[PDB]
């Protein structure tokens, strides 16, 4: 009997039986709606072919593939099976507490038991061997630690003598009635004095601190919140995995390893099957010295990818209601489950789980064989519970270390777990890799121990930009592929028809995962993630869910301690609105914030609020010097003290550039892995800025973020300053850039910056062609960059606007020389508005951009304040703009056969099309079915539709009149007769 219990189900004799009554064919006309919801006493069953079987049996003729040694008490390994392990790969790491007493009957060598006596944290390395064998290697020995000021503590209690301290902490822990679990001993702690320095400030001098080790995070946590009343505490937030990686040089979170002898030729101990803590084929106890990095050896082992996607159906009153997991009537009816070799890429298994009989189409089956793909295996069931258990039984038994699909984090996994926990009261702590007590939860964002979930939806929202992110949509843009035959509203209808129509549902389900697969092996996300994990020193599962600061803290921590630091704990030239007929050039700085940090030596360690005790070294040379926020600040440079961030980033930039110089002289396969790394360094570098300015995150320092803000500003003001001085005349520009020869346009020449924002400047170029300006702009930026700023800082050129409506602040419309329209901080469309108001509103903005007469006339408006155009007539070039509004009025009034164009719709609801019609004096009580209007020759409501077009035009083209909506309203009125106002 396992020394630690298996909490997943290896038997159920009874359970909650829920199934749609349609499934009954012994079925009167009336008894076929809704759902059965009762208790049934019998084992859960699977059907596959004419065959059946208990869902929880392992042995003979099992319907689905397993990778499982132990199944609730029985060892299913071949009598003989005893492989030896040397090298093995690691994809995931767990932290758990083990207690010596609970493990007595496990057959563990005393060095291990020693490590967990009252208690101890065990770090379990998860992965597999070259042969495919599933491994869990249990690292004993790692303790978490944290620091506290010696003399400060030594005074406020009182006792240098390191045992006195430990006793006082053990005595602190008794008094909390929160499970001291009789850990009221001075021996559950070691406390050593070391010299060190709080990272903050230039002045701060090395003090003496107590390093104190602890046996469990449980303990550490309490002492954070309680032992430190006034006393300052350092690196208490640092988990055991991260101590295990950082204190063992070279060690990684994702890599190959080998076990070897240690200190006194100590050897890793294989575990007896009955003390396995996970579902792996082999397990071992060891300490860090029994482990070594196995560099050179690099190839991904045969780990598996499960790719699934679920389909549901609504019960209750209205079967076209979107399904809700909390409803017992609203059932998961099918799950598409695909199993790949992740090292190979091959699709090994196609499984479809199905509530009710399901007969896949012959056509879909022909298409699978024809593509050299596995024949699907259809598992069918009478109830939702039987099918959910089956799926979860497969999730435990096959144990895909990797899992994927589309929106599975947002819809699929939440739906299925809501059902498992709430409706069926099944516990999940045992269904991951651990046999019990493991994490298996979704939040608002899922965490399943020993399972790396990568959701393709988010990956795709991260590489490609689109109008839509639906799969069939995504499948047509990215895989250039076309399939379009399903809608959640059709499911019920089809479900009720019979087993063939359920097959169709199953087809589109399998095909859905097929496409998601094809995408995962297109974008190889796990490899972007491994690389970050591998680089940041963190578990792969935290490279996705856990955000920003995590990826950077760890590295900051390693460096910080090298240096002998400790980390404390939780304790007016922007736009003048107007239109532009001359080209506008857009300069951007590349990774501005990180390049500032590095160039200007900015760190926790190098800043100060004091002028004194600053080595009194000297201003200018040794000092940065800034009027930051409230007051004056100072930052030392890389000769006096070099910044910890600075170092992180420089090292990462030198790494990227040395990796990038290699991409072309390596193999195709070597280049695919260097690209992922080269991109990983970029994900991590773009993080360091953010890391600084989280006011309640780990190591904030708002006075670095804010100095970077104010340096960002100065730099672009300098770029402004420069361009105006240097390029005021075309002659100097021709001397720097001889190709300007063929760029001189008719006008007078003038180069002026018009918009400044975060990291980009807009430069209006009179007398120049839009034609070669993007290429000349690179050079300009290169030139500027090489002339004004310190390395990494790099200004570049993206983009020339042939024409530009500069509305405001962060709001503009432009056509891009050589491209499309770009619209920022506005839309010219509304899903809610009728076609006609949208099409015309749009036609207007196109006249302004694409009609050269309207474009000059629009430009000329800028030569004159809004109010002065009220006095005088608008420039004639706008005749065509007015022709469009006039024209729209006529579109409405006339017996004009397209009423459809004026239809509004604001399930049952919206969908009812209507139109607003002419005539107490009524208020949109003049809705009407369209057909009725037509059939009765009813006029549309001129005043209504037109005033909506006038309003929309008015908000889009205020810019031509300094954003005064009033003046705009008045001037566009001149283009239409007053009797139509």
Report DSSP letters for 171-193, one per residue: HHHHHSSS--TT---GGG-EEEE
Q: Is residue 937 part of a domain?
A: yes
Q: Cα–chain-centroid distance for residue 946?
A: 44
Domain identity same for 492 and 535:
no
The end-to-end CA distance of the chain, in Å, is: 88
Q: Are residues 92 and 229 in the same domain?
A: yes
b/e string for 573-610 if b means 16 or more Cβ within 10 A? eebebbbbbbbbbbbbbebbbbbbbbbbbbbbbbbbee
SS3 980: helix
Handedness of CA 814, 815, 819, 820 (dihedral sign): positive
CA gap 434, 420 in Å, rounded? 18
Which residues, other chains included, contact 710 with Cβ-Cβ below 8 Å and sequence gap of 6+? Answer: 626, 627, 628
Are 617 and 748 within one domain?
yes
Q: How far apart are CA 204 and CA 521, in angstroms?
A: 51
Report which of 327, 338, 408 is spatially closest to residue 374, judged by C-alpha positions: 338
How far apart CA 564 and CA 872 sit, in angstroms, is 74
SS3 of 454-497: EEHHHHHCCCCCCCCCCHHHHHHHCCCCCCCCCCCCCHHHHHHH
DSSP state of 546: S
In a domain, 659, yes or no: yes
3-state class percentages of the chain: helix first, strand second, coil last, to nearest 5: 40, 25, 40
Torsion of CA 700, 702, 704, 709, to 10 degrees: 140
Distances from the Cα of 956 to the Cα of 754, 844, 848, 860, angstroms: 20, 9, 11, 18
Q: Rounded distance, CA 587 to CA 798, Å?
A: 7
Report the C-alpha gap between 486 and 467 in whole angstroms.
20
Question: How many Cα atoms occupy the beta-carbon half-sphere of 11 within 13 Å?
Answer: 4
Report the distance separating Cα 141 and Cα 112, nearest Å. Answer: 8
Residues linked to residue 440 through DSSP beta bridges, in sequence order: 448
Residue 631: exposed, middle, or buried by beta-carbon count in 10 A (0-12, 13-18, 19+)? exposed
Residue 744 is classified by DSSP as: B
Round to whole Å and give the CA distance between 408 and 401: 16
- Map residue 378 onto helix, strand or coil: strand
Pairing of β 282-287 and β 134-140? parallel
SS3 label, residue 252:
coil
Distance, CA of 246 to CA of 251 (rounded, Å): 8
Q: Three-class SS of residue 948?
A: helix
Q: Is 408 within the bounds of a domain?
A: yes
Distance CA 953, CA 947 (A): 10
Domain harbouring 667, CATH code? 1.10.287.690
Residue 63 and residue 116 in one domain: no
695: enclosing H helix or E strand = none
| Strand runs labelled E in 849-920 | 915-916
CA distances in angstroms from 839 to 36, 490, 732, 744, 899, listed in the order given? 51, 32, 47, 37, 14
Q: What is the 8-class DSSP label of residue 940?
A: B
CB 357 within 8 A of CB 502: yes
Q: Which residues does 724 contact at the CB level (< 8 Å), separation at least 6?
A: 751, 752, 753
CA–CA dist 747, 802 (Å, integer): 15
Q: What are phi and psi of 691, to 5 degrees?
A: -45, -35
Burial class (CB in 10 A: 0-12, 13-18, 19+), 763: buried
Vertex 779 angle, CA 775 and 781, to 5°: 110
Q: Are 475 and 481 in contact (CB under 8 A)?
A: yes
Q: String of b and e for 614-623 (b: at least 16 CB within 10 Å)?
A: beeeeeeeeb
Residue-wise DSSP of 274-336: GG--BS-SEEEEEEGGGEEE--S-------EEEEEEEEEE--SS-TTSPP-TTSTTSEEEEEE
| β-strand partners of 255 | 90
Residue 1, domain member (yes or no): no
- Kind plus residue range of the DSSP H or E element containing 226: helix 217-226
In a domain, 3, yes or no: no
Would 442 be classed as within a structural domain?
Answer: yes
Rounded Cα gap, residues 72 and 79, in angstroms: 18
Check whether residue 381 and residue 465 sit in a common domain.
Answer: yes
Q: 252 and 76 in contact (C-beta within 8 Å)?
A: no
Secondary structure, 3-state, 524-537: CHHHHHHHHHHHHC
Q: Is residue 650 part of a domain?
A: yes
Q: Which helix (H) or strand (E) element contains residue 508?
A: helix 499-523
Find the helix or strand (DSSP H, E) in which 939 lies: none
Annotate 566-600 with DSSP letters as a single string.
E-B---------EEE-S-EEEEEEETHHHHHHHHT
Handedness of CA 788, 793, 796, 798 (dihedral sign): negative
Say how many domains are in the chain.
Answer: 6
> Resolution in A, one decimal?
2.7
Core vs surface per residue 191-226: b (16+ CB within 10 A) or e: beeeebbbbbbbeeeeeebbbbbbbbbbbbebbbee
Give dist(CA 150, CA 157) in Å, integer: 10
| Helices 879-893 & 852-860 angle (0-180, nearest 10) | 110
The answer to whether 842 and 827 are in contact (CB under 8 A) is no
Q: Which of 122, 167, 500, 436 is nearest to 288 (CA)?
A: 122
Q: CA-CA distance, 137 to 122, in Å (whole number)?
A: 10
Secondary structure (DSSP) of 323-376: P-TTSTTSEEEEEEEEEEETTT--EEEEEEEEES-----HHHHHHHHHTT-PPP
Indicate whether 600 and 644 sit together in one domain.
no
Q: What is the 3-state secondary structure (H, E, C) of 54-117?
A: ECCCCCCCCCCCCCCCEECCEECCCCCCCCCCCEEEEEEEEEEEECCHHHCCCCCCHHHHHHCC
Backbone φ and ψ of 538, nearest 5°: -135, 160
Query: Which H or E element spans position 255?
Result: strand 255-259
Cβ neighbours of residue 708 closer than 8 Å, sequence gap 6 or more:
593, 596, 597, 602, 689, 692
3-state secondary structure of 259: strand
Phi (first) and psi of residue 498, to 5 degrees: 155, -170
- Chosen domain end from 786, 811, 827: 827
Give the list of residues 6+ apart from residue 739 with CB closer than 8 angstroms, or none.
Answer: 772, 775, 776
Q: How was this structure determined?
A: X-ray
My answer on whether 602 and 736 are in the same domain is yes
H helices, E strands: number in the chain: 27, 38
Sign of torsion, CA 825 830 831 835? negative
Q: Rounded CA gap, 685 and 661, in Å?
A: 19
CB neighbour class for 695 (10 Å; exposed up to 12, middle 13-18, buried from 19): exposed
Sign of the four-CA dihedral 458, 461, 464, 466: positive
Between CA 795 and CA 776 the distance in angstroms is 13
CA distance 925 to 620: 74
Coil vs helix vs strand at 15: strand
In angstroms, the CA 798 to CA 551 distance is: 30
> Is 602 found in the same domain as 555?
no
Last residue of a domain, one of 36, 63, 81: 81
Residue 42 CB neighbours (<10 A) = 12
Non-local (6+) Cβ contacts of 391 within 8 A are 335, 337, 353, 416
Q: Give how far Cα 704 sits from Cα of 282, 914, 980, Å.
A: 50, 57, 59
Choose one of 773, 804, 827: the last residue of a domain. 827
Instruction: Provide the 10 A C-beta neighbour count for residue 377.
Output: 16
Q: Determine, yes or no, domain membership for 188.
A: yes
Alpha-carbon torsion 608, 645, 625, 573, what sign? negative
Residue 391: closest CA among 355, 437, 444: 355
φ/ψ of residue 99, rounded to 5: -125, 135
Return left, alpha or beta for 661; rule: phi > 0 is left, psi -120 to 50 is alpha, else beta. Answer: alpha
From the list 959, 936, 949, 940, the residue with the least C-alpha distance to 981 is 949
Domain, as residue range, for 923? 828-981
Residues 478 and 519: beta-carbon distance below 8 Å: yes
Contact between 432 and 450 (Cβ < 8 Å): yes
Q: How far is CA 664 from CA 116, 219, 432, 531, 660, in A?
A: 51, 52, 41, 20, 8
Where does 640-729 have alpha helices with state H?
644-660, 668-693, 702-726
Distances in whole angstroms, Cα of residue 737 to Cα of each of 569, 734, 743, 772, 773 = 54, 5, 11, 12, 11
On whether both 158 and 57 belong to a single domain, the answer is no
What does DSSP say about strands 282-287 and 291-293: parallel, antiparallel, or unpaired? Answer: unpaired
Shared domain for 857 and 867, answered yes or no, is yes
- Report the phi/psi class of residue 247: left, alpha or beta, with left for phi > 0 and alpha for psi in -120 to 50: alpha
Q: At what angle do helices 835-850 and 852-860 cross, to 10 degrees?
A: 80
Total residues belonging to the chain:
981
H or E stretch at 220: helix 217-226
Do 820 and 834 lie in one domain? The reply is no
Q: What span, in angstroms and rounded, lies between the C-alpha atoms of 698 and 704? A: 14
What DSSP state is assigned to residue 140?
E
Q: Are 565 and 198 in contact (CB under 8 A)?
A: yes
Written in H, E and C, the secondary structure of 637-650 is: CCCCCCCHHHHHHH
For the beta sheet containing 144-149, the strands, ordered from the edge strand earlier in sequence to the opposite edge, are 233-234, 144-149, 207-214, 190-198, 565-566
How many other C-beta atoms can be found within 10 angstroms of the C-beta atom of residue 933?
18
Q: CB under 8 Å to 668, separation ≥6 — which residues?
A: none
- Do 401 and 518 lie in one domain? The reply is yes
């Amino acid at each position: 009997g396992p020394t630690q219990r298996h909490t997943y189900y290896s038997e159920c004799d009874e359970f909650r039986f829920i199934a749609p009554r349609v499934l009954d064919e012994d079925a009167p006309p009336e008894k076929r709606a809704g759902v059965h919801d009762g208790h049934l006493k019998r084992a859960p069953k699977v059907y596959c072919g004419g065959d059946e079987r208990d869902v929880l049996r392992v042995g003979s003729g099992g319907f689905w593939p397993r990778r499982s040694r132990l199944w609730g008490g029985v060892d299913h390994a071949p009598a003989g099976f005893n492989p030896t392990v040397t090298v093995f790969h690691v994809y995931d790491i767990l932290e758990n507490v083990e207690h010596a007493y609970g493990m007595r009957a496990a057959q563990f060598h005393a060095r291990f038991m020693d490590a967990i006596t009252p208690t101890g944290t065990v770090i379990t390395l998860l992965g597999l061997t070259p042969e495919g064998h599933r491994v869990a290697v249990h690292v004993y020995g790692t303790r978490q630690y944290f620091y506290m000021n010696k003399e400060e503590v030594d005074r406020h209690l009182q006792c240098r003598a390191p045992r006195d301290l430990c006793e006082r902490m053990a005595a602190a822990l008794r008094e909390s009635p929160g499970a001291s679990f009789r850990g009221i001993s001075a021996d559950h702690f070691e406390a050593e004095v070391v010299e060190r320095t709080d990272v903050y400030y230039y002045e701060t001098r090395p003090a003496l601190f107590y390093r104190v080790y602890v046996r469990s995070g449980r303990v550490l946590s309490y002492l954070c919140d309680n032992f430190c009343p006034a006393i300052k505490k350092y690196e208490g937030g640092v988990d055991a995995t991260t101590r295990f990686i950082l204190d063992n040089p070279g060690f990684v979170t994702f890599g190959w390893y080998r076990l070897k002898p240690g200190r006194n030729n100590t050897l890793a101990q294989p575990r007896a099957p009955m003390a396995f803590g996970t579902s792996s084929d082999v397990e071992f106890n060891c300490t860090a010295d029994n482990l070594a990095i196995e560099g050179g050896m690099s190839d991904l082992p045969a780990y598996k990818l499960m790719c699934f996607d679920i389909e549901c159906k609504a019960g209750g009153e209205d079967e076209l209601a979107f399904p809700v997991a909390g409803h017992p009537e609203d059932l998961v009816i099918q799950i598409s489950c695909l199993l790949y070799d992740l090292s190979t890429t091959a699709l090994e298994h196609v499984l479809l789980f199905s509530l009710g009989s399901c007969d896949l189409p012959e056509s879909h089956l022909n298409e699978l064989a024809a593509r050299g793909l596995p024949t699907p295996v259809v598992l069918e069931f009478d109830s939702e519970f039987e099918m959910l258990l089956a799926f979860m039984t497969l999730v435990k038994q096959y144990g895909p270390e990797f899992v994927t699909g589309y929106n599975i984090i947002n819809f699929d996994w939440p739906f299925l777990l809501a059902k498992l926990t709430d409706i069926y009261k099944v516990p999940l702590d045992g269904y991951g890799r651990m046999n019990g007590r493991g994490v298996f939860r979704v939040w608002d964002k899922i965490k399943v121990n020993g399972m790396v979930n990568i959701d393709m939806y988010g990956i795709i929202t991260d590489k490609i930009k689109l109008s839509s992110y639906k799969l069939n949509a995504v499948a047509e843009a990215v895989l250039k592929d076309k399939k379009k035959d399903l809608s959640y509203r059709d499911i019920p209808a089809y479900y009720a028809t019979g087993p063939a129509q359920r097959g169709v549902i199953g087809e589109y389900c399998i095909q859905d995962s097929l496409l998601v697969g094809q995408l995962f092996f297109k974008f190889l996300p796990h490899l972007e993630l491994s690389a970050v994990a591998r680089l940041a020193g963190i578990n792969i599962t935290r490279t996705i869910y856990d955000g920003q600061q995590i990826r950077v803290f760890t590295c900051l921590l390693r460096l910080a301690d090298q240096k002998g630091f400790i980390l404390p704990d939780t304790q007016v030239l922007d736009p003048t609105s107007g239109f532009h007929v001359n080209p506008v050039v857009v300069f951007d700085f590349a990774s501005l914030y990180p390049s500032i940090i590095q160039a200007h030596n900015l760190c926790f360690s190098t800043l100060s609020l004091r002028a004194d005790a600053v080595a009194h070294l000297e201003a200018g040379k040794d000092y940065l010097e800034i009027e930051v926020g409230g007051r004056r600040l100072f930052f030392v440079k890389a000769h006096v003290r070099e910044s910890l961030l600075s170092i992180l980033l420089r090292d990462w930039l030198a790494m990227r550039k040395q990796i990038r110089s290699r991409i072309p002289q390596s193999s195709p396969e070597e280049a695919v892995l260097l690209d992922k790394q080269q991109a990983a360094i970029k994900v991590v570098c773009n993080s360091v800025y953010g890391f600084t300015g989280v006011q309640h995150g780990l190591l904030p320092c708002l006075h670095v973020a804010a100095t970077v803000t104010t340096i960002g500003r100065e730099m672009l003001l300098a770029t402004r300053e420069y361009v105006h001085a240097r390029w005021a005349a075309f002659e100097q520009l021709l001397a720097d850039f001889p190709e300007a020869a063929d760029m001189r346009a008719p006008g007078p020449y003038s180069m002026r910056i018009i918009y400044g924002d975060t990291d980009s400047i807009f430069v209006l170029c009179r007398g120049l062609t839009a034609a070669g300006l993007t290429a000349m702009g690179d050079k300009m930026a290169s030139h500027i960059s090489r002339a004004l700023f310190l390395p990494p800082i790099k200004l570049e050129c993206e983009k020339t606007f042939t024409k530009l409506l500069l509305i405001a602040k962060k709001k503009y419309i432009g056509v891009i020389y050589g491209g499309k329209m770009l619209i920022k901080g506005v839309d010219l469309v509304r899903k809610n508005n009728c076609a006609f108001i949208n099409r015309t509103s749009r036609a207007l903005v196109d006249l302004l951009f694409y009609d050269d007469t309207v474009s000059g006339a629009a430009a000329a408006l800028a030569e004159r304040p809004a109010e002065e155009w009220l006095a005088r007539p608008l420039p004639e070039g706008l005749q065509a703009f007015g022709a469009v509004l006039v024209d729209a009025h006529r579109r409405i009034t006339d017996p004009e056969r397209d009423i459809q164009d004026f239809v509004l719709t604001a399930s049952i609801k919206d969908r009812i099309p209507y139109v607003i019609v002419a005539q107490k004096l009524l208020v949109s009580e003049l809705a009407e079915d369209p057909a009725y209007a037509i059939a009765h020759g009813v006029a549309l409501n001129t005043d209504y539709y037109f005033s909506h077009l006038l309003g929309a035009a008015c908000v889009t083209f205020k810019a031509l009149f300094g954003n005064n909506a009033k003046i705009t309203e008045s001037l566009l009125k001149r283009f239409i007769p007053e009797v139509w106002h």
